[PDB]
Design a protein around this ligand. Structure first.
Ligand SMILES: [Cl-]
Ligand SMILES: [Cl-]
Ligand SMILES: [Cl-]
Ligand SMILES: [Cl-]
Ligand SMILES: [Cl-]
Ligand SMILES: [Cl-]
Ligand SMILES: [Cl-]
Ligand SMILES: [Cl-]
Ligand SMILES: [Cl-]
Ligand SMILES: [Cl-]
Ligand SMILES: [Cl-]
Ligand SMILES: [Cl-]
Ligand SMILES: [Cl-]
Ligand SMILES: [Cl-]
Ligand SMILES: [Cl-]
Ligand SMILES: [Cl-]
Ligand SMILES: [Zn+2]
Ligand SMILES: [Zn+2]
Ligand SMILES: [Zn+2]
Ligand SMILES: [Zn+2]
Ligand SMILES: [Zn+2]
Ligand SMILES: [Zn+2]
Ligand SMILES: [Zn+2]
Ligand SMILES: [Zn+2]
Lengths: 471, 471
């Protein structure tokens, strides 16, 4: 009778076109890099511009009874908080972020990180997809239920401004806000990936991440390499030898058992199913150069590599002159930034201790070796047992708006707040989902928000909120 | 009777103190970086200042009949040429350079690369020892024989300005000057090392050197590492795997047989003797950090590692953000500058082909891999059979001025012109020697010229020139 699922989609599409898109485009212009990428973010004022821009829009599109506050702690990024009272005596917590990754290199000639460009049904620019859409879609999902005169639960929306720097500000806000937030029964987060743009993707796990700096030195100044080569070990050779203690150079297999966990059987089964759904799109849509290929061909194992196994990337370095600048001097120091994704269930403290010991003990040639972990190292997340009402709601929503079943897969990235919530609220259910499908390029050049996908996804969120109301 | 060996030393010491040192100190102020370190060297005018400074001094300290010319080819570094006719119908060719390595980091607070500082009998500054002293000492060695009224051979002095960039200009000058230079019977080069500051060191070999850029890419833009890690091999892992094809990470042993030669037995014997002379000073005087140690403890083998075996150093890199700047993005490209010293007898072309094939064939994961060698890759040198007259002259000179025997050892660095001369003039004898002993720090911070050493060395050169006259 009161609930019209296609009415939800029609309203949500109109809202996306007429109300959201202009505002979101204006948000893309704001160069509000997260604090790790701009230590002077406060002085520069862009973060403040962004939170006021999104807050302004929320206030003019407010559900009934909404309290909105830009919450502020000293020297911290601001936090956008909304409380929508609803009529049902239960709470849902919706989360996203509004801070951005930096420009990056490789933008197409017609595209720019701080210039919104709408082409081929895609909205290009930094932060449209990751994660500017989140506040808009979350609030619109509630507004769509009000359009139909339907009741809904109490909703708390948290749109933070430190996520791209590890959410280090967030625990302080949650301590301030704890009693006001209360106990959510459902957590919705619109900052995750999608296997394709054809169905609803439910994230069943997130990896942890630990970042540190490995420094290796044998000598305290640069030395003529003719004199030294053959007697003084080069610090680069010692550094790569140390990395071989933790990672096999041929396969990439991490050698430290403390960086693995047992993978739940249901996640192995889900990976099999997702391999069948995606086929070669498990890997084919990475920006491979020439005939480059993935580390192995088995699609299920690739999914598990990405979701349930540790993996190292070397993301920066100090101590190297530019090649065109360089003479032949043997360098005094090699420093490498090591970024280690962790399986969902691995404790970052235990993994940190294991990495530091493996990399620093018994130094080759009594080299001076340090491995300094960055604070803000964060645990992954594994979904709790899925409630029947949410399995049904997700399936129904996906079939309604995509005409395809909901699909369940792990996410290879890291969203620190989900681990926090899963620990604080062990009985909460989660809907962690998003729009970051193939070529969406979060953290990369030519980032886009897929508009068809986000309209359908916003509808799914609204449908699940309605379903929550009925359980 | 006419020859007074101590008279040579007395005059040479007075000349060093009164005539050379002020001029050499003024030369240290000139920041004439070699072209590899300053592409605008011609515009900047420092190279021209340096060659005119040394030429001015030579003209005012000229032996009889000297022709001096600053020889110039279009767009090439200038070349300082002297011809001193002498009275004996044979030719000696004396060589050094006046171009400089750049500043480097790590200078002591009271010291500066372009500020001469004389302390503790040492002259600090860039280019005093490597290799500004060479023109002064070479000309003074001849002047000392004129002081005594002694005859000497025809002498050609070549002081080039491209040595620190691989002497790429020099073949063009030698083609221009070939017929004027004629056929030297003895080559003296004052740009080599010394095991200690206590005796004459005769260089019996020089290593070759090949430099190239290794580039590895799997993807054509940076990608979110959460998405990619576990599926797309990191380019750093592939690069270190490739380096393991050519170098064992545990020992530093080069794995390519084409980069080794047979070591002449007499050089193995000489290394044994030099190990006995030097003891732990084979390695103890490198600037080790904390308790860092050399790659092995065997002193003779360390000498041979440094002189007769290939060795790799990684001297620069492109494609890495600074660690404090960096996010966690998987990088599109890893590029490393590889500097490979070669044994004296190894052909750099054959070694180049072997390195490029080993590094680029069968690329892991069909990565895009390139290894591009820098032109100006240069062969080492091995001394010819030592003539009895020169063995005697070197021994006599060393005993006279140092009260210790001459010592014979290989040099781990590279002087391209010596290979050129050894090929062009197979019957020439060589006296390749110098002042670069422990802590002298050529190519490093706090470079110094040891003044006692250089006075005695200049005397040895003069003694050997007198001996040449008598054979
Ligand atoms: Cl910054
Ligand atoms: Cl704005
Ligand atoms: Cl605005
Ligand atoms: Cl760009
Ligand atoms: Cl060097
Ligand atoms: Cl050496
Ligand atoms: Cl992430
Ligand atoms: Cl709970
Ligand atoms: Cl330059
Ligand atoms: Cl001058
Ligand atoms: Cl002057
Ligand atoms: Cl310095
Ligand atoms: Cl990333
Ligand atoms: Cl992923
Ligand atoms: Cl060299
Ligand atoms: Cl000859
Ligand atoms: Zn605005
Ligand atoms: Zn995000
Ligand atoms: Zn992000
Ligand atoms: Zn993903
Ligand atoms: Zn001058
Ligand atoms: Zn030199
Ligand atoms: Zn040099
Ligand atoms: Zn040496």
């Amino acid at each position: 009778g009161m609930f019209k699922p296609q009415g939800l989609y029609d309203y949500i599409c109109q809202q996306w076109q007429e109300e959201i898109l202009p505002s979101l485009c204006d948000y893309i212009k704001i160069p509000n890099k997260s604090p790790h990428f701009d230590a002077k973010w406060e002085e520069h004022g862009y973060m403040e511009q962004a939170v006021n821009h999104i807050a302004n829009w929320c206030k003019s599109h407010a559900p009934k009874g909404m309290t909105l506050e830009i919450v502020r702690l000293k020297n911290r990024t601001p936090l956008l908080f909304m409380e929508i009272p609803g009529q049902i005596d239960d709470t849902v917590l919706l989360y996203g972020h509004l801070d951005k990754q930096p420009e990056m290199s490789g933008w197409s000639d017609d595209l720019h990180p701080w210039k919104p460009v709408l082409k081929n049904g895609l909205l290009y620019g930094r932060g449209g997809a990751d994660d500017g859409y989140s506040a808009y879609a979350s609030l619109t999902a509630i507004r769509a239920l009000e359009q139909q005169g339907l009741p809904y639960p109490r909703c708390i929306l948290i749109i933070e401004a430190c996520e791209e720097s590890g959410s280090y500000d967030l625990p302080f806000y949650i301590e301030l806000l704890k009693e006001r937030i209360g106990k959510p029964s459902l957590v919705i987060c619109l900052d995750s990936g999608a296997g394709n743009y054809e169905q609803l993707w439910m994230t069943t796990s997130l990896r942890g991440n630990l970042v540190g700096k490995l420094t290796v030195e044998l000598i305290n100044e640069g030395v003529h390499s003719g004199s030294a080569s053959g007697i003084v070990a080069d610090s680069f050779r010692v550094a790569r030898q140390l990395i071989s203690r933790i990672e096999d150079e041929n396969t990439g297999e991490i050698k430290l058992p403390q960086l693995y966990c047992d993978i739940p059987d249901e996640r192995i089964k889900q990976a099999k199913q997702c391999a069948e759904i995606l086929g070669e799109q498990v890997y084919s849509e990475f920006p491979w150069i020439d005939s480059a290929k993935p580390v192995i061909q088995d699609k299920q194992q690739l999914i598990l590599n990405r979701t349930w196994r540790p993996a190292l990337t070397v993301t920066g370095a100090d101590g190297f002159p530019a090649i065109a600048d360089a003479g032949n001097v043997m360098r005094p120091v090699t420093s490498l930034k090591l970024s280690m994704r962790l399986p969902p269930l691995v404790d970052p403290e235990a993994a940190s201790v294991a990495m530091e010991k493996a990399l620093t003990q018994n130094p080759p040639y009594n080299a001076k070796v340090d491995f300094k972990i960055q604070n803000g190292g964060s645990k992954g997340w594994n979904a709790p047992l899925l409630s029947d009402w949410l399995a049904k709601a997700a399936s129904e929503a996906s079939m309604t708006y995509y005409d395809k079943p909901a699909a369940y897969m792990g996410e290879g990235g890291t969203i620190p707040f989900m681990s926090m919530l899963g620990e604080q609220f062990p009985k909460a259910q989660f809907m962690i989902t998003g729009v970051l499908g193939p070529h969406s390029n979060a953290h990369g050049p030519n980032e886009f928000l897929h508009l068809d996908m986000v309209k359908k996804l916003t509808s799914c969120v609204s449908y699940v909120l309605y379903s929550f109301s009925q359980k």
